[PDB]
Amino acid sequence: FVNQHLCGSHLVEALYLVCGERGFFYTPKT
Amino acid sequence: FVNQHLCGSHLVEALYLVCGERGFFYTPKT
Amino acid sequence: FVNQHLCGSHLVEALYLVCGERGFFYTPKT
Amino acid sequence: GIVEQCCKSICSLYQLENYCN
Amino acid sequence: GIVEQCCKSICSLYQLENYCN
Amino acid sequence: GIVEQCCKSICSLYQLENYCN
Numbered sequence A, B, C: 001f002v003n004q005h006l007c008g009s010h011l012v013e014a015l016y017l018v019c020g021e022r023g024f025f026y027t028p029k030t
Numbered sequence D, E, F: 001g002i003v004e005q006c007c008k009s010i011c012s013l014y015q016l017e018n019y020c021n
């Protein structure tokens, strides 16, 4: 996988590819 | 809607979702 | 074409549009 | 324009809808 | 969360898969 | 490469077409 900082909608799209049929959760809070 | 700064093609894609069947105008000039 | 700095996946998507049926090569190394 | 409101500052759903037709 | 690991720092394929279901 | 021309600087339509096949 790419060696860059993944942010915004690119981070969500990374998660989409990497999980696939498993799906994911994006909870961006501190 | 998201609390981030929307720029470039992400700003145009925000406008696409938010208007839908109304459409939009993107004129980026100062 | 747009007068901005094209990076990341936006640079690859620029190359996709600009070449089309010719295709391209993305080799990001220094 | 929109690049001073929604990119240099932040835009809510309504301040962005003013750029629809 | 994920915005401290994969955005403020860099994430490999595995540190990102921990955010799958 | 392309990351020094089109990302660190700006590329017109032609300087980007040199990266096609």
Ligand SMILES: [Zn+2]
Residues within 6 Å of the ligand: A010, B010, C010
């Ligand atoms: Zn982007």
